Symmetry: D2
Subunit: 460 residues, 4 copies
């Protein structure tokens, strides 16, 4: 078996030990393996997967395989692979092209190695994506391959937005499931995942005390809510920026001060618009938005000396790292930790006090500087992924006539009943006990004893 590329295949036994532990942490995912092992619902599925090559993702991959699928895998970030996970999957005879610390050129080559087998399109018929890079490459460069693909299952808020843009422009060629918007994904992974893994990544990157220091979190969606709590539970003084006044209201009610980097919140792109007094007090800024340039050049100039700067939104353009590459000297402390010397770009003084610490070169900090979300959280997301792969593979869109395709070309979520069944496996993994409604109680609130327990309008 040679159909892989990883950092170091000799890490495989360590990765396999960590997979066996992670299995014990992922009861929804292991439950789907046990339930569906017999029926082989993914027999004949040939899945192109592009998602962080972590231990949790290894458990996802081997669940899809255990259900009958063949896969070809890559990471969706240059710094998110755990090399022992990649090695364990390769050593199992699964095609994987992933290592921690890829270049952009290697990143694109890895996705290509999944799309091509022996220099020709692989007989792919399904896609699992996180962020939409593989989706975009198939649409732009491999339209013939999408002809035979039954669907896309998309992990993340950013990737869903890209799908919806394609659907609205009439350029989306195969149906998708939005896995992100299962409640056991969005309100589990995006929020509690970041709670666990943000302070984990800052500690591993910097070993800084957080207690007593000043943080600014840009955004208060699911990731900004979890991120703010990661920091506040360590004793940080957390301020929150938002453009959405409903998310801002939540921040205030959750006990955070809501501030703008700009005077009166007006971002007109002059230095004069920067609240230099506010930024000069900030010890840590974290971007969580999915948006562009929310920690901009003028904010970076105004930040407190030796502030930590990081991004936990899907892509690195949240922080103006291009400005920092053009203007300032980068001193590497260790992989995914750089001092950015604001003294200029012509070398640096090792003892200069005027620097920022940038984590993971502005890419997803939880996965770049630590191991991302813990397996027990990723269990929810990845149980959704498997159910989404089963649904779209069984629907066989590629085999439908033109007229039938027209009726099914959509971006849909999983039904609430499945969301509830994932949650129940998650709760039992904590040793939680869910109460059964009596028939009188079920009638009184207008639900089945079996669920679903909430209308699709319910926000949790």
């Amino acid at each position: 078996f040679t159909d892989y590329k990883v950092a170091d295949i000799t890490l495989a036994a360590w990765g396999r030990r960590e997979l066996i532990i992670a299995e014990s942490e992922m009861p929804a995912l292991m439950g789907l393996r046990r339930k569906y092992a017999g029926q082989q619902p993914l027999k004949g599925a040939k899945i192109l997967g592009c998602i962080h090559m972590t231990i949790a993702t290894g458990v996802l991959i081997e669940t899809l395989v255990a259900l009958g699928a063949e896969v070809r895998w890559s990471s969706c970030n240059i710094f998110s692979t755990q090399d022992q996970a990649a090695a364990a999957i390769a050593a199992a005879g699964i095609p994987v092209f992933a290592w921690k610390g890829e270049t952009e050129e290697e990143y694109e080559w890895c996705i290509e190695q999944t799309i091509l087998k022996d220099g020709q399109p692989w007989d792919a018929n399904m896609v699992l994506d996180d962020g939409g890079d593989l989706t975009e490459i198939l649409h732009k460069k491999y339209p013939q391959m999408l002809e035979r693909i039954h669907g896309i299952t998309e992990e993340t808020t950013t990737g869903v937005h890209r799908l919806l843009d394609m659907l609205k422009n009439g350029t989306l060629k195969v149906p998708a499931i939005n896995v992100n918007d299962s409640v056991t994904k969005s309100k589990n992974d995006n929020k509690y995942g970041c709670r666990h893994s943000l302070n984990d990544a800052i500690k591993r990157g910097t070993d800084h005390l957080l207690s007593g220091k000043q943080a600014l979190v840009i955004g208060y969606g699911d990731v900004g809510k979890g991120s703010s709590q990661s920091l506040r539970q360590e004793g940080m003084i957390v301020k929150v920026a938002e453009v959405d006044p409903i998310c801002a209201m939540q921040a205030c009610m959750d006990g955070f001060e809501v501030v703008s980097p700009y005077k009166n919140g007006i971002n007109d792109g002059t230095e004069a618009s920067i609240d230099a007094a506010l930024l000069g007090k900030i010890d840590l800024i974290v971007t969580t938005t999915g948006n562009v340039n929310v920690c901009d050049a003028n904010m970076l100039k105004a930040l407190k000396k030796r502030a930590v700067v990081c991004n936990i939104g899907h892509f690195d353009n949240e922080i103006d790292t291009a400005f920092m590459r053009k203007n300032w000297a980068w001193e590497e402390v260790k992989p995914q930790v750089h001092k950015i010397h604001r003294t200029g770009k012509d070398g640096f003084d090792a003892h200069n006090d005027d620097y920022l610490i940038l984590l993971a070169e502005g890419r997803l900090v939880n996965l770049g500087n630590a191991t991302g979300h813990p397996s027990r959280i990723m269990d929810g997301s990845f149980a959704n992924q498997v159910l989404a792969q089963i649904h779209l593979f069984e629907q066989k869109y590629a085999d439908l006539p033109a007229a039938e395709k027209a009726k099914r070309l959509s971006v849909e979520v999983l039904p609430k009943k499945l969301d509830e069944e994932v949650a129940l496996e998650m709760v039992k993994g904590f040793g939680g006990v869910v109460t059964q409604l009596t028939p009188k109680q079920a009638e009184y609130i207008g639900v089945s004893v079996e669920g679903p327990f909430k209308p699709d309008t319910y926000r949790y």
Copy 2:
């Protein structure tokens, strides 16, 4: 002016001082007053109002009046009136029939005094309701009056459920707005309101230390989430019961142990089904469900000696108080606090150790034993109420032809843009500063610089 009934009209000056302070705590509601005072959009509105006669409700009433409405008011709970609020509204020449500590017969008489003026149906044309008792009385006993009514605006989860049952059965006679499901209502009031006011009510009722004691919260919807945090922030050891596995998963991830009062979560109606070990360690039980008999006779028998029992869901049947009235002696400590002696019903021993403390006779404990949610939280709910009253009054359903009525008979929410404009007023009241998107950023995430910022699918 004699067209009222309150406990003590001499409390009016105290209530008016508290209204003036509450005005300074309610910028969304005061904002609507200032914005709409000139246009008088409720000129000709005649509003039957049935909602807790508190200081916050006073500010809501005087906002509707300031916008041109006439009203006739009652409380929707026997114990929720603040007598100084009721006095200040009566002393202003507004018809209100409300006092703290009504009987059921007085409660029904008060609603009837709103419906009748000088012994004849009032020319009502709008309804503001909280829990649906006034809605049900108009439908069952005054159907002729609903001919003239343009709409119902409903405050609470329980009242919405009752409207949706009427809609589904074809018995709803006028269109309604579900005020509850604005995010600035549900995810503000139902959650953060209970955070503030649950521990407040237990302290005022009992003066008990909560720190270090064991709580069981039944339910983990918006109210159970807020309630659990009310108790956990005081240092209670909180366990959470749920029938909805997605809500249970949230509980676990929020750091609570999820338990059932019943062995394996199966309540088959036997004492054998009760987890006597669990209930024997509980110092406080709080019901939050909107369901029936979630703290049942067998649970009450198994509770630890001197446990506190209370309900913060809309109606008192969450706790089996009928069982306690039939079997056990009630010793009143002070209004809305009773020792329930489990020794039997034939008098009580003042020194008996075997009692439970029931708050507010099992009625909404935050309003019964304290003052309910703080005005700054009720600002969101009541700004939505005013917008909903303006919308349904302006739509003039009662004046539509038969064909037009058919098309408009619905239970609807307010548009997200209005929800965001309420939130922004709330955020400014904290001195929060919301960031303005740049045109490039607004294009990048696919929103208008003015919002709305989120799809209607978004759960916050």
Copy 3:
């Protein structure tokens, strides 16, 4: 029985119900009753008591009586009496002179009614004091009475400081126990008591939302630590002022921003020295210091409009209320809540926006606007008081010859073994289980299996 003065004797039955509940919350105190009831160790003790006439203090009083003592009682604050507690103690035939809302003249008359019986010195032989007012009156005005007094047991940090000043000046006439510095007092009452009761008092006084608002706590000793947590757990953004850099370090490490009301912390008494930017953002200031003028005239001028101002340190000169009485109009909202109109002193405008809300006229806010600490916390303090009364009464200082007195005239704390025995009763009241050391473990750490478990140097 007529040897009392209380607000309303008809409140006695309500107070007695609350005493019987409080007994169930005070296992250390009830434990001392049961242990010592037989031995009557306070037979012949005649105790002048001056401490907040609350329900917890009623349980203390009836414990001293149950051990054989006679008492004559007053409160140590004009607003701290619970009238139902005072009535229950009077109705039991115990001399008590206390009501909520005394004048200064009534306060002094009440202490005098304890000292005098039938217009002559009572045959007092013990003193229980909280703050040192009764101690000072006996020393200044009744030296002949101290001749026959065996000791003083002093509750609070301020009262101990006054005793130590007397000891150092050679003016202290009888030995004292410092009850404050039992760990089951200082690190229980002073800290956790304020955690429970500060936000309780602000809620009862104002019903304000705290979540999302800005607080400044002056001081970070035991009371400032508890006070800061009371506010932070509600979601306040808490800043902390301190003069003690070790207490300030704790604040920083506990996740608070440490600020001064003065520029660079320099209090030179010009308006120019005030950080107007900081004070203009503060929604609540709480003084916790035991010191004078820590919320001074220039700070009060600079505070944000409609800020709440309160004191939870023993005496009201922490806030410059004398400046506010001289310069600004007071509008009473309700007892122990005043709007202080900064527009001037010549009446007020009911609708003026420029006011502060002062709680309890600057006197102890937890007891003034709520019920002070919960009984389960006061159990520790009051178990210490009883043990201290037993010790000094049994030592019989007044009967010692001059030479023997000289050897015993001291301010001492209780032995650690007693501190541990109080704690153990407190832990069992939570249903806590303390582990017993094995003989090998006891030898390994160098302690008896029975304790004491820590050297007297240990700070906990």
Copy 4:
């Protein structure tokens, strides 16, 4: 330069980058460098140092050198060295013998390499110790060397206990400072250090979700307080065991359930004494005691399957790791992480469900599986160490006449004034501003404007 032993000297540049960052995190320590660089108060000091060879310890070593000292260094734990710190110190030409993952034999050899230079006792005259192993070796094996030594400065609770046993037995040969009991050490390092670093080490070791899981912390001293908060802030359900009822009372008041591993807290050496129900629900046990066998063989047998076991007290005998080495198969997952298979010792099944995860082989888990306390916390401890070294070096005990030695042979703490001056540097490092007392205020509370602010009795 060859007078060292480290893992890999090529790590020196990485370690030096991390020293330069740590300098910016350690203002008390860098303050002492700048203040004392000119006076060279450790000119002629020859310091045997035995303390964790971390980045923070590097900054301590180079401060002592900058003040004039020569040193010879080793770690006080086999797993606590950061190899890049050891390399950076060796590359600076400082003798250090330390690497992560020493054997016991290498550990003893490393201490001996400090004691011997070129095979002969080094002319040592000062000792800096953490845990007392170097102190004990000099007393037992090199008594002649203690003739020349002016003092010992001891870091930790365990090492202080050992010194006090030596003092009491008349076997202590040189005076010592108890650095541990500075407030800026004990109530900073021992508590907040473990808050930061316990969850850090469990995350790096296991990547386990902590939220929603059950923890048992044995002990609630400074380390158990910090440890319990490390876990509770992550959303663990934390139970606390204690033998000291005052520490247990704190636990209850801090919102933790106090339990014993043994029925009624009595461990009589039988499996029957184990609370199997309690231990069967525990997902993580952490020992914090400084005592022996507090997580014993019977507890380990009764623990839930796949529970994590770790020790954050100084020495590994807190957990019965000898029982586990004698009875159960150890599967190494990665360095300092072992699955302990309870199926027996004759190999293991890679897929066995019945295992515990032991971190750092039961050695100090924060240093073994992460990087120990953050530099900003260690700043307090290490500023005290430097002041203690200056004081004992300047007192020159070894040069005193016999009579003078007699009078100075003691275990003492640093004066409070120095403790306050360390704290103030720490507070300024957060950008905290300490308020200056006015002369009137300083007189009112009876302190100097300069401090000290508290009596030596004060516990903070």
